[PDB]
Every structure is written in C-alpha cells, then in structure tokens.
Amino acid sequence: GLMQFTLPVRLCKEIELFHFDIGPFENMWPGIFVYMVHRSCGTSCFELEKLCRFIMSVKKNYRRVPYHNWKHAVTVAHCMYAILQNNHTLFTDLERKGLLIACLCHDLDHRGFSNSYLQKFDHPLAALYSTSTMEQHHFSQTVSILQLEGHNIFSTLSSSEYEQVLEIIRKAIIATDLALYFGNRKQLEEMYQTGSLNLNNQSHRDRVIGLMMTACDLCSVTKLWPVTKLTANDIYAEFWAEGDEMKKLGIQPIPMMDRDKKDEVPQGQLGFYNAVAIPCYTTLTQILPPTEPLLKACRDNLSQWEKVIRGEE
Numbered sequence: 001g002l003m004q005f006t007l008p009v010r011l012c013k014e015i016e017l018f019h020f021d022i023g024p025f026e027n028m029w030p031g032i033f034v035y036m037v038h039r040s041c042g043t044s045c046f047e048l049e050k051l052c053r054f055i056m057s058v059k060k061n062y063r064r065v066p067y068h069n070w071k072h073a074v075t076v077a078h079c080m081y082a083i084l085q086n087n088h089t090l091f092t093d094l095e096r097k098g099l100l101i102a103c104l105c106h107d108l109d110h111r112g113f114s115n116s117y118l119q120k121f122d123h124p125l126a127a128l129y130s131t132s133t134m135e136q137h138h139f140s141q142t143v144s145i146l147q148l149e150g151h152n153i154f155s156t157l158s159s160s161e162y163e164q165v166l167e168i169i170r171k172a173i174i175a176t177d178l179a180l181y182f183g184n185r186k187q188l189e190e191m192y193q194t195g196s197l198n199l200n201n202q203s204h205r206d207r208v209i210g211l212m213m214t215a216c217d218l219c220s221v222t223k224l225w226p227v228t229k230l231t232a233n234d235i236y237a238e239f240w241a242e243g244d245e246m247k248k249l250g251i252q253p254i255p256m257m258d259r260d261k262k263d264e265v266p267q268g269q270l271g272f273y274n275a276v277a278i279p280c281y282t283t284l285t286q287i288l289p290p291t292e293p294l295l296k297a298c299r300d301n302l303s304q305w306e307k308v309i310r311g312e313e
C-alpha cells in the first residue's frame with residue numbers, strides 16, 4: 001500500500017495545470033495515469049497489479065493511427081484529472097473512479113474514421129450500432145477488457161456500486177459522440193439560464209458529466225499554441241485519410257476532409273472554435289467556475305488562428 005508513483009519536479013507541478021502536455025516518452029504515460037488515479041481517488045481504490053494489467057491491455061487495444069491513439073487516451077484522462085482536482089467536493093468517490101477510466105477507454109480500437117464513414121462504407125459495426133457507432137464499440141471493448149482474467153479493477157465494489165460505475169462509464173463514453181454534444185449543451189445552457197440546474201437530479205449530473213467528457217475530448221484546443229498547432233496536423237492527417245476513402249466510395253468529401261482544400265483549414269478551425277469549442281468551455285465554466293482556464297486557453301488559440309488567416313503567421 002505504501003508505493004506512490006512520483007514524477008520529476010517539472011511534471012509534478014505542471015501535471016496539476018489544465019494545459020499540461022504528457023510529453024513524447026510513451027513509457028512514462030502509464031505512470032502519469034496511475035499518479036493521477038492515486039491523487040484523484042486514493043492509493044486504495046484500485047489494486048496496483050490489476051490496474052497496471054488493465055492499463056497495458058487498454059494501451060494494446062489503441063491502434064497506430066495519427067490522432068485517435070494511446071496518447072489521445074492519456075491526454076483526455078489528464079484533462080478529466082485537472083477538472084476533478086479543481087472541483088474536489090462536487091464528485092462522488094465512484095464518479096472519480098469511473099470518469100478517469102472512462103476517458104482512458106473512450107476511443108478504444110478507433111480506426112481513425114468517423115461514424116459517417118462507417119455508415120457509407122457499410123461497416124458491420126454500423127449494422128450492430130445504428131447511432132453513436134464507434135462509441136458503443138468503445139464501451140463494448142472497455143467491458144471486454146474488464147472481463148479478462150486479473151483485469152477487473154472494480155471487483156472490490158459491491159454489486160450495486162459495480163452497476164453504477166459501469167453505468168457512469170457507458171454514459172461518459174457515449175457522450176463523446178460529438179453529434180450528441182450540441183443538444184446536451186443547449187439543454188444545459190437553458191437549465192443554467194432558467195436556474196433549474198440541480199446536481200442532485202441524476203439526469204442533470206449525467207448531462208454535466210457528458211459536457212465534461214466533450215471538454216476533455218476536445219482539450220487539444222486548450223493547450224499552449226505550439227501543442228495545439230502540432231496536434232491539428234495529426235487531427236487533419238486522419239480527416240484527409242477519411243476524405244481519400246470517401247473519394248474511393250465515389251463520394252466528394254466535405255472540405256474539412258479534402259486534402260485538396262488544405263488552404264481552407266485556418267477558416268475551418270475558426271468555425272470549429274466558434275461552433276463547438278468556445279460554446280463547450282463557456283457552458284462548462286458557467287457550471288464549474290474553476291474550469292475557466294480551459295475557456296481562457298481556448299480563446300487564446302482562437303486568436304492565434306485569426307492571426308494565421310490575417311497572414312501574420
């Protein structure tokens with residue numbers, strides 16, 4: 001029980017900040033995740049042996065794609081860590097356990113293609129799951145890995161606590177379907193404005209946890225500009241591969257995914273920041289004031305993209 005993970009001084013301090021980058025050393029990422037679980041949850045909430053074997057099976061089931069990879073997984077878990085640590089008293093013991101695991105597992109076995117592409121391709125996964133296709137798959141893969149021998153990190157929960165945490169994880173992973181984000185945020189906006197928002201109402205918590213998942217998932221836009229800028233290349237490498245596969249099915253892809261329309265990326269980033277990212281972190285800041293640094297970092301990056309369009313970079 002007396003085994004803490006310890007990070008070098010610079011990581012120990014910077015890991016507490018929303019804009020932390022987990023670095024290019026793959027072999028440190030599992031240790032970074034355990035560190036965050038220990039500080040976020042306790043040294044007891046997981047058996048280290050079981051947790052380590054879970055993490056390395058999760059890592060194994062992320063693919064070598066440009067963006068939707070093991071690093072994305074650990075990056076999204078870190079954002080959730082920073083939200084939970086700046087909102088200590090608002091979240092249950094179970095919620096803290098569930099949500100870091102949810103974030104680590106949220107893109108399991110991603111192939112770097114949208115739900116749209118699976119549907120137009122007619123992928124078997126699109127027949128099994130008619131909506132939130134990849135996200136139902138991600139949850140399915142999470143459950144499969146929990147059920148490997150020696151991998152059940154929740155085995156010490158009671159039967160009802162076990163059902164609750166798997167329910168938390170399922171909703172959390174489904175909520176990372178950006179198509180569901182728009183309605184979720186609109187509804188949260190109304191509830192905040194009418195003053196009907198109530199964190200004791202479970203359906204309300206679910207919605208708020210959904211928004212936290214979108215916020216963590218999109219968090220590459222909340223980094224320092226050089227991180228944001230270099231992540232965008234990985235993001236667009238996947239989009240352009242998808243556009244190519246669309247052209248192969250005889251479908252003109254949307255410009256976002258067309259590598260011939262590479263000039264239009266700076267304008268398309270504005271649209272994304274204005275349509276998705278800024279609204280997301282605004283509503284999150286209204287509900288959870290200590291997550292304001294994500295809104296502030298997002299606005300900084302919007303301004304950096306405006307400077308790209310105006311020729312200044």
Ligand SMILES: O=c1ccn(-c2cccc(OC(F)(F)F)c2)nc1-c1ccnn1-c1ccc(F)cc1F
Nearest residue numbers: 178179217218219220221232235268269272275276
């Ligand atoms: O920089 C971006 C530009 C465009 N889109 C995007 C994705 C998907 C639907 C989309 O259209 C609409 F917004 F209108 F729905 C836009 N996402 C990002 C982004 C930033 C951080 N993460 N992601 C992200 C990446 C890849 C991804 F699959 C999901 C992401 F959120």
Ligand SMILES: [Cl-]
Nearest residue numbers: 039040085088
């Ligand atoms: Cl603490």
Ligand SMILES: [Mg+2]
Nearest residue numbers: 106107134176
């Ligand atoms: Mg996803």
Ligand SMILES: [Zn+2]
Nearest residue numbers: 072106107217
């Ligand atoms: Zn993701």
